DNA sequence: CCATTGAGAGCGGCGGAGCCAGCAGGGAGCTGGGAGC
RNA sequence: UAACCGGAGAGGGAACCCACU
DNA sequence: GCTCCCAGCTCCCTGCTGGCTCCGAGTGGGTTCTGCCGCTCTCAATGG
């Protein structure tokens, strides 16, 4: 069981991390100190509140 | 045990300086994911320091 | 014997057309030239060479890796390559029940020797 | 011949469309007479390794 | 037992719920966002969006 | 990266693990074990 | 010098899980023709 | 009152099994 | 002829199913695989 779950784990989680980065890659902290994305829509008003 | 790591070489003064000021290894000790060190003392040295 | 049936039906389809193009001239037909020898000799030699268990015209539709190059790296890899079984279940299979060691492989299949990759 | 033109354009359509999309649902894939289907323009950039 | 900082969970739950509905993290959630076609062709579908 | 890096080391019934992370990420209408806690 | 033609060679053929689209089955309620004036 | 030579990135594609971390 | 009753009609929505897309990084090596027949035009060997 451990050898089976290792080999399915490797390929199933590597796809979660890719979907996450595509959905959030351009969110960043502006000089406004506000957290916006590529369309400049404000996501959080301060980083991490 | 047979692992291989890659090694990229920055090819300009402006990329060298940026790596040196942003990704050098002692700058990366504390992770922001869980705000704790990523490097610790971990074999043979940890057993011998105990 | 799964190959040699299809390869023996192809040559009866060849000696058919060759009896046909030849009785219809009303001449007589000869089989020495109708027997296309390159149906057996090359169908076998092809599928045993690529591994695709089929014909060459439909080889993306066949099984694959049914025939692999023998591993001569140490005697114990030769010997184990010759006694290897294969469950054909595809990869990209997120199911486990065909990859589990069933109770019923006791004494038949080695319970320790399996590849640790995705197979 | 005002009847063959219909078949001529049906086959022209098949060719011009499998040039830019080789995988069609329910349509014969354009193969090369070696027996392997083609790499259309959509496949050159479809998935991973596009 | 592991711990992830809170910043990183607030940010993911904020992007998912930032446009007023539940935006999934799949091709139907993030490609329907109006980000601009050169960014959507990199995640999935790659020509259907172009 | 901070939610995917720990995700690689994870695994009545509540389907935790990556099977659950995938149900939250893909807001899925039919989850596996949909309970209330009254 | 004359010349039909084999041979050379070249081109015309002959698995599994999850979103949207389509459809079909199904009520609210309008309007012409009947009902009672 | 004399003495022989001069040229240089080449270069290749498609498919399949095995294996490593 | 007047006012008002009713089924047929009109459009509405709700629900099942077919179609389409995706499925981890990297790496090494290997072996097999660039269509096949054949019918006309041309060459210059070789018959009179
Ligand atoms: Mg290792």
UniProtKB/TrEMBL annotation, chain C:
The protein's role, per its UniProt record: RNA-dependent RNA polymerase that catalyzes the extension of a non-coding RNA (ncRNA) at the 3'-end using the four ribonucleoside triphosphates as substrates. An internal ncRNA sequence near the 3'-end serves as a template in a single-round Pol II-mediated RNA polymerization reaction. May decrease the stability of ncRNAs that repress Pol II-mediated gene transcription. DNA-dependent RNA polymerase catalyzes the transcription of DNA into RNA using the four ribonucleoside triphosphates as substrates.
Parts forming coiled coils: none
Residue intervals of the RNA polymerase Rpb2 domain: 68-119
Superkingdom, taxonomy of origin: Eukaryota
Name of the molecule in the record: DNA-directed RNA polymerase subunit beta
Family statement: Belongs to the RNA polymerase beta chain family.
Residues of the full protein shown: 527 to 645 of 1300
Location(s) in or outside the cell: Nucleus
